[PDB]
C-alpha cells in the first residue's frame, strides 16, 4: 500500500532555480538546554554507574548504670543504574544526492536536522525516560519521582492541579555526586556525527542501490545519586495560570519552596527547567508581585528571568506541557 | 524520465472498473504540499490502449487524505476519450499545490467498463514532454 | 502577486449559476502548452464569500478550445465547498500541461445556485502562498 | 522550511536500526508593483521660474 | 539499559501456557560459566501485564543443556504472582555460575493459563536499578 521511507525524490523539495537551499528556515528546532548545562562524567561500572548510599544509622543508647551495651553497625545499600545508546544512520541514494552536484550541500542540510533531532530526542528522554517500558532507553526524570508515596515523594511538590493540561517544573543540581549524565568505556559524550562516505546499499529485492550514509552515536546514562538534590513541581495546571498570581497556581512561592527543599545548594550547580509556557507566565507574575512594590517606569517590561534565586532558570522546550496529573 | 522507486504508484494496473490506484503515496508530513515545489507532477502513462465497449473516458485525478482511509480529489483532468489512450500517452497532472499526507491516483471511468488498458502513475521531475510544433507551414 | 492585465480573466465576477468566466485568454498560437513554463498557474481568488442557500460547491476548471467556439476541461479542482470561499482564498490550478488557443475559466457550481460571490481568475508566475507551518508542536 | 526532524532510536548491541529522513516543505511569497507617473505641462512648471521648486 | 541483541531470547514472547522461550542461547564452549564473568544476569521484563483468569503465577527460570535438546533448571524465581507483573517489572535472575552450552528460558505458569502478557529475556551487564531510599524519615 503506502510506499516509503529512506529519502524519496524530494531533494527537489529543498532546491531554487538551482542548488540546495542553504538559508533554510529551521522550524521545528526548539531551544531546550539541559544538554548544554548537563555534566558528563565517565560511568564507573562496566555499563552502569554504581553508587554506595548510607541506608541506616547506628543510633547509640542511653545506658542504665553498670551495663555493657550493644555495638552498632551502619547499614548501607548501594545502587547501580545504567546507560543507553541512541544512535542513527542517515542514508541517501548516491544517485539522488549527486544531481546538480548538491551532494555535499545536501549531506549538510540533512545533517543540521540530524543534530537537532538528536538533541530533541535526548532531552525529551532525559525527562521522560522509561527504562521500564522502552527497555533500551536509560531512565530519566520521570518516573523516578512519580507516585507521592515513593521515598523521594516528599521532593515532588504538588502544584495542586488536576486534569491533563498540566506540566511540572524541575529543579536539579548538576554535580558529580548529586546528579549527572554518564558516558561509557570508552565512547565519549556526546553526539558523534561520523561521515561513513559512499558505500553500496541493498534494493529490497537484492537489486543493488548505491549511496552515502552518516552515523550519529550519542550514548548517555544518568546518575541520580540522591533524590534529595532534585525536586519536581508537579500538576502545574497551565490553562489556569494567570499573571496576577491569582487564579490557579502561583509560580513564585511554588518555585522558592522548591528552593528550600534542597539541602544546601553547595555543589555543583542548581538549575530550574521550566516549559517555555511556564517561563512566560513566570516573567509576568514576577513583575506583577513587584509592581505593588517597587518597579521603575523603564523596568516595566521585567528583566527576563535569569537567576531566579541565584539559580539559573533554564528554558527547556523538550519538556511536555500536557502531562498527566501525578496522582 | 527518472523515477523514484517509492513515487511509483499503480505500476501497470489493469484498470477495468472505475477504481482507485493500487498504491497510496504516504508523504511524511501533514502537508507535503509538493505543488509549491514547482517541479513534482503526476504522470499517468497508458498501455496498451483503453479498449472498451465505448465510447468511454477515463478521468485521471489525484486524491488527498488526512489518513490512509478517506480521500477527496484535489486535482483532475477531465474526460480524456478512448483512442486518446494508445500505448504511449502520458496524461500529466501537475502536482496539486496543497497536498496532505497520503496521496493516491484515482481512475474515474465513465461507462462502459474498460476491457484492456494499464495505467502507470508516478511523481516525476519532470515529464518527458516534447510535442512536435509546425514549421512554416508554407514550406511545405 | 504580479499580474499581466492580458491574462486577467473574470475580474470580480458574481458567479451565481454554474457559469463560465467573462473573459477568454487568447494566446497567439495553436498550442501554447503553458503548463511547460512550470511556472504559469491559474488562480481563482475569492471575494466576498460563497454565500448561497447552500450547501453548495464551486468546482473551478480551466477550458481550452481549438478556436474560440467550444470549450473542454483540461484541468479541474474538485468540489471546493462553500465556507472555503471566504474573502481571501487562492484556489490554485496549476496550468494544464497541454493548452490550446483560447483558454477560459468555468465555474461548475453544484446546486443550489450561489447568492453572492466574486472571483478573480488569472495566470501568474507565480502565486503568493505562505501556509503556516508547525512549531514543536509540543510547546505549545 | 523544515517540516520534520529525524527521531533516532536506542539500539541494542548487534542490531542495525532504520535510517531517518528529514522532511521539509517550501513556501514562496510574491510581490506587487506600486507606481505612478506625474506629468505637468512644461509651460506650467517653467513659469514664474518655479520648474524645480514645483517639481 | 544496554542490551545485547544476540544474548536476547524471548524478544517479546506472549506467555500463555507454561512454554519455553523462543530462542535458545548457544555459547561457543561446553562450560561457558558466564555466571563466573560476575557481571552477566538474566533479566525478564514484563508487558503488558499478567492478565489472567487468575490467580496465576509466572516462574522465570534459566535452563542449561549439554546440547540443544534436553534442558534442566539452573536458576529459578518462585511463583511471582499476577498483579506483580505490571508493565515494567524487571525480574532479575543472576546468571548461574555453572553454565553449560545452550541456556534457555522457561515460564512455569501456575493455573490458569495467562491470557495476555509478553516477557523479554536478556543477559545484560547490568540492570538499571536505582530506587529511592528513605532520608529521615521524620522529615520525611
XYZ file of N, CA and C in Angstrom, chain A residues 5-6 8 13 24-27 85-88 91 109-110 113-114 117-118 120-122 125 136-137, chain D residues 1-13 15-26:
150
model
N 10.160 4.711 3.654
C 10.965 5.945 3.588
C 12.481 5.834 3.912
N 13.316 6.059 2.907
C 14.701 6.428 3.198
C 14.964 7.904 2.837
N 13.037 9.751 -0.384
C 12.338 9.827 -1.678
C 12.714 11.093 -2.416
N 12.461 18.989 -3.251
C 11.759 19.739 -2.253
C 12.632 20.780 -1.542
N 17.867 27.661 5.006
C 16.547 27.033 5.157
C 16.028 27.424 6.496
N 14.740 27.746 6.630
C 14.305 28.221 7.950
C 13.861 27.113 8.871
N 14.673 26.996 9.920
C 14.702 25.845 10.787
C 13.563 26.020 11.689
N 12.507 25.287 11.406
C 11.276 25.496 12.116
C 11.197 24.665 13.394
N 22.262 3.661 24.540
C 22.893 4.264 23.381
C 21.794 4.714 22.465
N 21.905 5.946 21.962
C 20.951 6.464 20.987
C 21.685 6.791 19.756
N 21.547 6.003 18.703
C 22.318 6.350 17.525
C 21.577 6.089 16.271
N 21.828 6.891 15.238
C 21.323 6.583 13.884
C 22.130 6.863 12.640
N 20.930 7.559 5.518
C 21.275 7.215 4.126
C 20.495 7.904 2.993
N 22.687 19.859 4.667
C 21.394 20.387 5.081
C 20.648 19.325 5.849
N 20.888 18.080 5.483
C 20.305 16.961 6.196
C 20.885 16.784 7.617
N 19.529 19.026 10.517
C 18.335 18.431 11.060
C 18.653 17.211 11.876
N 19.716 16.489 11.568
C 20.019 15.373 12.490
C 20.525 15.781 13.867
N 17.619 16.791 15.692
C 16.717 15.712 16.040
C 17.217 14.908 17.222
N 18.545 14.783 17.330
C 19.132 14.062 18.462
C 19.001 14.844 19.745
N 16.783 16.917 20.399
C 15.368 16.881 20.608
C 15.036 15.603 21.328
N 15.643 14.488 20.921
C 15.211 13.204 21.483
C 15.832 12.931 22.829
N 17.064 13.393 22.943
C 17.878 13.182 24.110
C 17.271 13.935 25.275
N 13.937 12.664 26.281
C 14.028 11.397 27.022
C 14.714 11.499 28.368
N 15.352 -0.300 26.183
C 16.554 0.237 25.557
C 17.049 1.626 26.042
N 16.130 2.514 26.441
C 16.492 3.870 26.894
C 16.925 3.874 28.338
N 11.428 25.327 4.297
C 11.310 25.452 5.735
C 11.043 24.126 6.396
N 11.912 23.758 7.334
C 11.920 22.416 7.936
C 10.591 21.872 8.522
N 10.184 20.708 8.056
C 8.892 20.188 8.453
C 8.983 19.045 9.437
N 10.086 18.303 9.398
C 10.251 17.159 10.276
C 11.702 16.855 10.607
N 11.982 16.582 11.878
C 13.294 16.090 12.279
C 13.374 14.550 12.233
N 14.574 14.004 11.996
C 14.752 12.571 12.212
C 14.615 12.294 13.708
N 13.905 11.240 14.108
C 13.725 10.986 15.548
C 14.788 10.121 16.278
N 15.684 9.468 15.549
C 16.572 8.479 16.153
C 15.969 7.283 16.891
N 16.832 6.345 17.292
C 16.484 5.207 18.166
C 17.616 4.741 19.064
N 17.237 4.115 20.159
C 18.166 3.456 21.039
C 18.347 2.096 20.422
N 19.587 1.641 20.279
C 19.842 0.331 19.666
C 20.469 -0.625 20.625
N 19.949 -1.846 20.622
C 20.594 -2.923 21.342
C 21.798 -3.401 20.525
N 22.799 -3.978 21.198
C 24.059 -4.375 20.543
C 23.853 -5.396 19.438
N 22.628 -4.872 16.252
C 21.323 -4.777 15.618
C 21.083 -3.418 14.937
N 21.231 -3.376 13.603
C 21.156 -2.130 12.835
C 19.756 -1.550 12.730
N 19.629 -0.292 13.150
C 18.346 0.418 13.257
C 18.075 1.211 11.989
N 16.813 1.560 11.733
C 16.473 2.195 10.451
C 17.049 3.573 10.254
N 17.361 3.902 9.016
C 17.726 5.279 8.693
C 16.509 6.194 8.758
N 16.785 7.469 9.069
C 15.805 8.550 9.185
C 15.928 9.505 8.024
N 14.931 10.372 7.878
C 14.808 11.263 6.739
C 14.263 12.552 7.285
N 14.910 13.668 6.984
C 14.416 14.970 7.453
C 13.486 15.657 6.486
N 12.188 15.526 6.704
C 11.215 16.149 5.827
C 11.148 17.668 5.926
N 10.987 18.329 4.778
C 10.987 19.789 4.732
C 10.284 20.332 3.533
N 9.199 21.058 3.757
C 8.402 21.746 2.722
C 8.771 23.195 2.412
N 8.434 23.673 1.235
C 8.720 25.072 0.977
C 7.502 25.938 0.702
